[PDB]
Structures are given as C-alpha cells and as structure tokens.
C-alpha cells in the first residue's frame, strides 16, 4: 500500500551539550535538525512531546516541528526530536559575528515577541495558553528572513529548571506563585527583557556598538550559582546596564525603556508579550 520513508542520514553534529546532541540531518534530501536526548534529560523530550500531542503548534516564530520518535535499543531507549533546520543557527552564535542595523534589530525582537505572543495567547475553538520557561538567546534560531524563532519547550507549561543567569527575582527568591500560570508568563517576560538587551549592544549607532556579552557578564561568573544569582537579583536588585551611547538613538532609547518594562521587582508590573510587540510596532 505504501513506503514511511524514516531513514535519516545524520551529517554533523551543531550542538552538544550536558543533556544531548543537535544533528543537522537529512531526509528526502531536506534538511532537517534531530535533537537525541540523553536519557538524564528524557522528561524534556516527553514533555515537548506531550505539549505538540496536546496542540499541533505552527507558527512562523516558533521552530517547526516535524516528529518525535521513540526507538527500542537492547538496554536502553532511544528519544529523538525532529524539526525544521536553521542554517543560520542560534542568536546567541550570531550576535558574535554580527552587528546589526536599526531595521536588522527591531526584526529580530519583534519577531521573537511574535513568537513568545503566539505562545502566552489561549485560542478558543485553537491552543492552551503555554509559558515557555526557558527563554535565552542559545534557544532562539536566527531565519535566513532576518526573523528569529523560539526553540525548546522542553520546560513548557499549559494552562529540569532554567537557566539560572536568565531566572526572574521571583524564581530566586522562591516567592513564584507556582499554582498561578501568570507567574509563568512574567518570568519569561524577565528573560525576553534580557534577550532585548543582548540584541540591542549589537546594533550600531553613530558608528559605536557593545561587544557581545551574556546578561550580568559584569557581575556573576560563568556557570553562576543560584545564590550568585539571587544576591545580584534579589538583594541587591542589580539590572543590565544601559549604555550612554544608547541614548542618542531614538530605537535604543525606546528599547531601553521597553526592557525596564520587563524588568520590575514585582511580576505584575512588567508589560505582557502583546503589549511589548505594540510598543515594537510603533519604534521607527
Ligand atoms: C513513522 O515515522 C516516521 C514517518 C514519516 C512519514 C514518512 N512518509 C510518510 C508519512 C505519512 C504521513 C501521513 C500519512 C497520512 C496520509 C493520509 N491518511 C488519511 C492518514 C495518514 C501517511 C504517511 C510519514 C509520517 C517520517 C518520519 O521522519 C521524518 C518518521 O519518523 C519520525
Ligand atoms: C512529518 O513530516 C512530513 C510529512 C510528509 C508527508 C508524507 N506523506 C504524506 C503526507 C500527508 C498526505 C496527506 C495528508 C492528508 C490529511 C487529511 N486529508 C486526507 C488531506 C491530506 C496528510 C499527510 C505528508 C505530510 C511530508 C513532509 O515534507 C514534505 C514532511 O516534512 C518533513
Ligand atoms: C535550541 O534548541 C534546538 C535547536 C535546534 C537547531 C535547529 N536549527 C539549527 C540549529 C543550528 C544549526 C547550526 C549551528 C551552527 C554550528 C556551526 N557553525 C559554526 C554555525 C552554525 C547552530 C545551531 C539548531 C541547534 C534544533 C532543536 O531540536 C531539533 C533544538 O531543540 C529543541
């Protein structure tokens, strides 16, 4: 009756880390990404899996998906996640390699807006509201259109912890209300603020632009522990620096301004997705 072509040929590998491997691979002469997990990190891949089971994502700031496959090995199981191929790779990656222009700028965190609006949104008729509680410049890829997409929700939740340089005040202090799904749309807002700051040292103005730095560079060191983080954070209430330069251009200065908004000590001060991609709208 007919041929499931599966066979994917893996060609190199673009990313490994503790909890697995990324693959650019190859099926029906398409690129593809197959992410295989570690088994120390199955419950990411059960997750995203549950959630795709649960909606059927598919939005043009969202890293598409193609499959999750399962395989039985003799003493072990083996979880592989599909999707489309970004041959660009991640922001993180680029923003070494590249200075951006005003247009270049407000493409790609408007896009990454879209993307995280498209995910907050409950649809009637449709998706669950879904929070992604992992935002971060490794775990959004750069399109070949100049738009960026949101990748890994593993951590996601509807209505594994993340990445401590990106958690909001709330997570370090163990104040989150955890029974509220706001409090999950909040924290990621604390962490787009930090990815619109990364963005924003790279787009040159009157010929000066800041070299690619992670957030708190200055202030924690690499692989910063929970009470690193929270010191900074919580009790000294520290926030990214705004450069002078950024206030002769009118686009920093309003990105300035917009990533104060996601920066507030208190979660429900901070500006939603939907009000953040307005704001990006009316900037130049
Ligand atoms: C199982 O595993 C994998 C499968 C595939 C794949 C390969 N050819 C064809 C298919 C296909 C899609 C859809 C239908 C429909 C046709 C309409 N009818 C009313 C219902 C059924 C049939 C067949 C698939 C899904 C790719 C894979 O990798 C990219 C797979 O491994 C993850
Ligand atoms: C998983 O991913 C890929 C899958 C395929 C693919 C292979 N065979 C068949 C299909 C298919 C055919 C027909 C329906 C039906 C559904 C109901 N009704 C009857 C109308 C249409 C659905 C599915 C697809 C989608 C191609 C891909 O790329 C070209 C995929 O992407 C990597
Ligand atoms: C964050 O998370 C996921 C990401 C991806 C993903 C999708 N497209 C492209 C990539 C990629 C390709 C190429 C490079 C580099 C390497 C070599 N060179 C020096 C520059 C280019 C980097 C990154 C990735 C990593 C897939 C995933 O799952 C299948 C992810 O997990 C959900």
């Not at 399109?143 to 997570?171: F, S």
């Amino acid at each position: 009756q007919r041929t499931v072509a599966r066979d994917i040929t893996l060609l190199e590998c673009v990313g490994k880390g503790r909890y697995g491997e990324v693959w650019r691979g190859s099926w029906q002469g398409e690129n593809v990404a197959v992410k295989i997990f570690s088994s120390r990190d199955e419950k990411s891949w059960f997750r995203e899996t549950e959630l795709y089971n649960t909606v059927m994502l598919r939005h043009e700031n969202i890293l598409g998906f193609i499959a999750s496959d399962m395989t039985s090995r003799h003493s072990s199981t083996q979880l592989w996640l599909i999707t489309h191929y970004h041959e660009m790779g991640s922001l993180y990656d680029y923003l070494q390699l590249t200075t951006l222009d005003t247009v270049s700028c407000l493409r790609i965190v408007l896009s990454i807006a879209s993307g995280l609006a498209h995910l907050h949104i409950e649809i009637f008729g449709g998706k669950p509201a879904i929070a992604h509680r992992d935002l971060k410049s490794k775990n959004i890829l750069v399109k070949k259109n100049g738009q960026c997409c949101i990748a890994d929700l593993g951590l996601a939740v509807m209505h594994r912890v993340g990445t401590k340089r990106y958690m909001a005040p709330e997570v370090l202090d163990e104040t989150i209300q955890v029974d509220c799904f706001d409090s999950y749309k909040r924290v990621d807002i604390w962490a787009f603020g930090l990815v619109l700051w990364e963005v924003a040292r790279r787009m040159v103005s009157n010929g000066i632009v800041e070299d690619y730095k992670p957030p708190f560079y200055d202030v924690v060191p690499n692989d910063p522990s929970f009470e690193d983080m929270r010191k900074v954070v919580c009790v000294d209430q520290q926030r990214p620096n705004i450069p002078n330069r950024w206030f002769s251009d009118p686009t920093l200065t309003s990105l300035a301004k917009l990533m104060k908004e996601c920066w507030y000590q208190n979660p429900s001060a901070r500006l939603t997705a939907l009000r953040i991609k307005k704001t990006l709208t009316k900037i130049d």
